[PDB]
Amino acid sequence: ILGGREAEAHARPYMASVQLNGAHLCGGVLVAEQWVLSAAHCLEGKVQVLLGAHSLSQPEPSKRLYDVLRAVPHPDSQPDTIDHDLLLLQLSEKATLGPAVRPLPWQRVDRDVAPGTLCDVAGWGIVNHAGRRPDSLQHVLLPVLDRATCNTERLMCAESNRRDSCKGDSGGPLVCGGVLEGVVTSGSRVCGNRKKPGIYTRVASYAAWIDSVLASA
Ligand SMILES: NC(=O)n1cc(NC(=O)N2CCC[C@H]2C(=O)Nc2cccc(OC(F)(F)F)c2)c2ccccc21
16 A cells, blocks of 8 residues: 555454465455455465465464465456456455454445545555565555546546555455455556556445355355
């Protein structure tokens, strides 16, 4: 997250860190007791999910690491596009839920968020153009753009005036009104440049797919 602030500890209990070899790789969102949503290019070693965290490195009683039983990328995802860039991760067991570990409701109704609404994006992605990697969860509020400025019907954008998502925030949540609306996409892009908006996968466009996969337990 560029141009953001340290989040309050455990105040976004849906957050997840998607980890490779013990190292944060992508954001993710707990969307059911046993399922985390993230981005497709995250899956392309050992993939694990860390829930209940604020610090990546410091002891916290709420922190628990999970193995992944099944990874379900979107079947139309491809490694060279940011279309269909969703990934569902089934945890090896149901997560122990509590105030620090809670699923977030996600948008099933296919309507755009009102342009200019401020939504919250969180993550442990880089925090400056030197690639400084934060130990504690970051977040920022960002205004949603109209579709015509963003240019599909399956993507939304947000302003990128120095405040923005960036590398390592991929897969993480864009939240409005307490509901997941977007998932940070996982393609490379210039960050922080007002002419080059942040891009996020519109979760409401994928309602049937998500429901399907979650139906499969
Ligand atoms: N939407 C955005 O603006 N972006 C999304 C990006 N894609 C990723 O981010 N990833 C691809 C999959 C794994 C992942 C990744 O590289 N993860 C990664 C790799 C090394 C270190 C790392 O941790 C930390 F973020 F802290 F650096 C994460 C990205 C890259 C550069 C610039 C903008 C970017």
